[PDB]
Amino acid sequence: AFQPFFVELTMPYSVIRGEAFTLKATVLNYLPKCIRVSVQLEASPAFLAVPVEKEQAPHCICANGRQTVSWAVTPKSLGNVNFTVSAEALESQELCGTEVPSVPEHGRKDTVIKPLLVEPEGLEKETTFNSLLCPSGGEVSEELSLKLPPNVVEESARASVSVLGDILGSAMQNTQNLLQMPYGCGEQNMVLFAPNIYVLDYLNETQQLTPEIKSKAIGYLNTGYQRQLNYKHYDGSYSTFGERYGRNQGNTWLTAFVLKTFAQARAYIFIDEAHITQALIWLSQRQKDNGCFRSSGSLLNNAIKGGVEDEVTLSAYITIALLEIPLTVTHPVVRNALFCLESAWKTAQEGDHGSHVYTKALLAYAFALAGNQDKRKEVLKSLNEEAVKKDNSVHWERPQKPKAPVGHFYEPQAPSAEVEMTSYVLLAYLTAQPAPTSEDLTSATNIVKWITKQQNAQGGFSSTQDTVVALHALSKYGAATFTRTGKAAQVTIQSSGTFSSKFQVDNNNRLLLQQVSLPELPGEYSMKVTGEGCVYLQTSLKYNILPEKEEFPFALGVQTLPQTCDEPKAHTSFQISLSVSYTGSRSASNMAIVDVKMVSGFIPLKPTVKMLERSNHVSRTEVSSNHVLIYLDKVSNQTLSLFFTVLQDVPVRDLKPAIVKVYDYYETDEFAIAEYNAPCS
């Protein structure tokens, strides 16, 4: 195989508002002959071309001849754009040197089509809404008004809608990931075994998964259950290490998670029912005769989980576990804790805060065993309304809070917030005895889509645990893949500007995705549907922010370089010191949040080495290869510092700074930004 020509281009990068970056073209000859090659670029009015070599053409080169061919351009649009360049060799031009054959094969002219991405100005976000219309052989309609424009940015706000009932899950690329006994700290054993348990339910039920690896996961669990035998308490409770703390209770998330799968896993190796009923009588002894018991919870415990330590939600955690054992007075006990939860549910009905984490998981499952849970099918709609989500996930930002207290969507819990929410939400969806064809099924299919789209089994997710929990969603949907859905649904999408696009859904459009956008600055979405069964349609309004925002209590102490380039060798190598700590770190969840990215045309080499070196008393040495993660440590203020440099990939650049800031410390206050750009420019 051989070709006497090839193109080396400039992969620009997700680039900045100033679109004048550097773009060149370098065509090189490997055949020993000299050949002329005319060159031009197929352009369009979508961007503002500026000719550098306006008057003279990059003309003619020979064997191993080097020529840079670059132009200037300052586009107006945003998004993926492909530049179509062409280069052709002609005949009868023996004047560059002595001779030009210029007779190639059917690959006559050289052309390249380079899709370059451009990042819009400022920081990107959205604000979606959630809407449900389900007539029973009739018609229901609603209006959605989409307006929150404070401190707008020019030409960023757009939107779209969709609805789905997806079947046809792709494949199993990401189901393969592994970890082992913590070399560093045994405290991580809790977050080890908490997800490894339900791998039992994932072997056959998927039909796509690789059950070899979960069959090995149960091999690890054959030691895990002995660790639990060693992590138990004599009285019946559980902790990180076990007994010698007698008169006290322990966390119930992991024991409630694991007791049902000990009941399903008492087949391979025998665990007696004594081990279940001792935990049970431990659950039974703590209940008062009249009162909803007190339980002071240690909040921000890195070993166990990150939460809010609301003792009533723990009183509900015991009872989701009680719901399994078929004792029939146990169900009156879960009714008592359901009255405590009814306190919590009125707190939810106010719609201000119930921590948005726990009752979500428990309300469905408590009644999903019984079979009269249409009330819970109704509250799961309210759970679905509580999300600023992508088409399948949540990314970053609650809309425009005037109200100070918000429960849990942009807390220091930062596994990107989509997985640990959507997982328990799907657990809530499809535990139903009756045919769940109604909106819960459709939303479950909405969740499964991006889970199937994750075609990377790395394990270097935005988080580190939650890739384990993401495989709950695809897996439990394996049995729910069989259903009956598709009706005389005729959807109508209208807005103020005399526009009306019609849509329809059936059993063959059950899996069809409808994407349609509108560019109007007003936002209004009146809908009208028909048919039978209940299905949920979703919105998404993408828009950038942060042209220039004020300073705020957070202290991102970033230092770029010694105050300027002011020299011919700078603008390439300059180490950026960052020293950061929000003093607010009190009792939310393990240190999870960080974002640090590269500005447009700068590549990291040594930063990787430094981060590999960094460790603050405890560490996971997690990485993204454009970011850095050394944060997981105990409750402490008193920041540290660093320095990391780059190299110049972009020779020329227009003026606007790139910035990489995520910031979540407490809910009452403003979310506390702090910034400083790059001075060399």
Place this chain on the structure above:
Amino acid sequence: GRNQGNTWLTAFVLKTFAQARAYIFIDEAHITQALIWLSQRQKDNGCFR
């Protein structure tokens, strides 16, 4: 596994495990597991064999 054992010594000793859970701690789990073992063997109607 699927068989019972003599009850003279366990019946003799369970009450004094309840009296002897003061010096060194035996949990009530150890009592109630023997108890549920005593409870599982009873038929609904018959005097078990």
